[PDB]
Write a protein that binds this ligand. Structure first.
Ligand code: 0NF
Ligand code: 0NF
Lengths: 253, 262
């Protein structure tokens, strides 16, 4: 059992609030992260969503997965993970425009695929992989999670509309691959969210692969296309994705 | 359940090998560390020790505690944990002789204290806390474990971290939260002096006899001068020959988290 004894966790500075939960930095045997539900009485749907997240995270134990540490049901619903120092991959690529070099982008790719493989082996479908959910711990270690509190990462069959599968996550990983090698989001020239949803859903729109860094190895570019295949079945599974990056990582540095 | 699906682990490089198992660098969803038995069929009392280690590791989910990932029985009894790059605190201090900064020395203690506080709360006595069992992953993160043999052996069982009540080897069980504290106090000594205690004595049995009867004690006057007053005071508290005059880990952690921001 992973229930943290009552009255141990001291909540500190308020990080991020969302329509559902709120995150605080806190103290429990050092620095910890705390995702709380700020409600006086939780509904059955809230209670159930809590029990899912906990049920899932307790099955994870891997360097590329955000480390789960415990939960508290009284006084308020809370999930406790390690405290990570750094930013999301989203932040580095699109906000503070960190210029990583090729070797490092590939290491991020590998590590993300490393953890993704882990989740899939245990029948865990992420359902919402995106650069924002990939936290870069100490600007070294990928820690995949759900920092949720959308659309660019959604595969066609998820937009047309349970349509989630191992392959739906690969497409999201494909978009993350795109972000890494371009440094930009897909469809940056289109400024109408509703139209993107329509177009990607019909196959009219695809990420423009021509925008890759000149020094992105061909093997990376070819893997990317495989992951973005509009049809579920054509997309490689993560064991093959990893193998492909691990073959490419070989003859490069 | 944390049994790893049969035959997924590939064992590679060979790191260390006592009589109680062999440590390998392996592969399971990335680079991992593997400790396993190399006998045909394990004895009843070897299977037990395996079951205890797994029993303990399964209860730990902490940044400063070495990350247990899974175990396997077929083909062999094996424990899988995360792979760590770098070397123990012992190596850095007494073999390669890294000249760490004071801020970092305090951080190294702050983390070991964090880790120990966690284990003690989960009702886990370490029983062999020493700078050999303090791994410095990527030279910036303390991972506490029992690396018996996966790291270099200490100068002299290892004796330097044992409290007086532990060395006297009384038939009644002497291991307590405080004995871990004393070991921490010796680790602190190691950090603050860059040296091992009782370095001017060359007889193992003398050291044993004298620490036990309280005729020997670490020489406090050996510490760096840029070492805080609040640290020396604490390090003396942790080494107090009286068992329960030694601060428990929550109070230790608070004291280090105090001066850390001044
Ligand atoms: C519901 C389901 C099945 N889709 C699902 C939920 C999650 N949920 C999480 O990962 C949550 C857990 C609670 C929690 C708490 C604190 C938190 O915020 C941290 C953590 C560490 N460091 C920092 C911050 C804040 C911002 C900073 O600066 N540091 C983040 C999270 C993330 C994971 C998975 C996965 F394992 F499959 F990926 C799957
Ligand atoms: C039985 C009991 C209660 N005394 C006990 C045993 C342990 N046992 C461990 O920690 C073992 C587990 C198996 C294992 C396997 C591989 C290994 O070698 C690693 C690991 C990581 N990285 C590296 C290496 C090699 C050298 C390098 O370069 N990297 C180390 C260990 C350490 C922990 C605890 C504690 F956590 F409570 F303190 C308590």
């Amino acid at each position: 059992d992973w229930e943290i004894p009552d009255g141990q966790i001291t909540v500190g500075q308020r990080i991020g609030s969302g329509s559902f939960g709120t995150v605080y930095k806190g103290k429990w045997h050092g620095d910890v992260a705390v995702k709380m539900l700020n409600v006086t009485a939780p509904t059955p749907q809230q209670l159930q969503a809590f029990k899912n997240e906990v049920g899932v995270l307790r099955k994870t134990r891997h360097v590329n997965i955000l480390l789960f540490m415990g939960y508290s049901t009284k006084p308020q619903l809370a999930i406790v993970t390690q405290w990570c120092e750094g930013s999301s991959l989203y932040h580095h690529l699109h906000i503070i425009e960190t210029k990583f070099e090729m070797i490092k982008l590939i290491d991020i790719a590998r590590q993300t695929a490393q953890g993704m493989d882990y989740l899939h082996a245990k029948s865990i479908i992420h359902r919402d992989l995106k650069s924002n959910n990939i936290f870069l711990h100490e600007d070294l270690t990928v820690k995949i999670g759900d920092f949720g509190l959308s659309i660019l990462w959604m595969a066609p069959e998820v937009i047309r509309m349970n349509p989630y599968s191992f392959q739906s996550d690969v497409y999201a990983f494909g978009i993350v691959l795109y972000e890494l090698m371009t440094g930009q989001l897909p469809y940056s020239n289109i400024n109408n969210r509703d139209q993107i949803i329509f177009m990607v859903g019909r196959g009219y729109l695809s990420p423009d692969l021509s925008k890759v860094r000149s020094n992105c190895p061909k093997a990376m570019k070819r893997l990317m296309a495989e992951c973005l295949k509009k049809k579920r079945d054509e997309r490689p599974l993560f064991p093959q994705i990893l193998a492909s990056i691990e073959l490419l990582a070989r003859s490069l540095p």
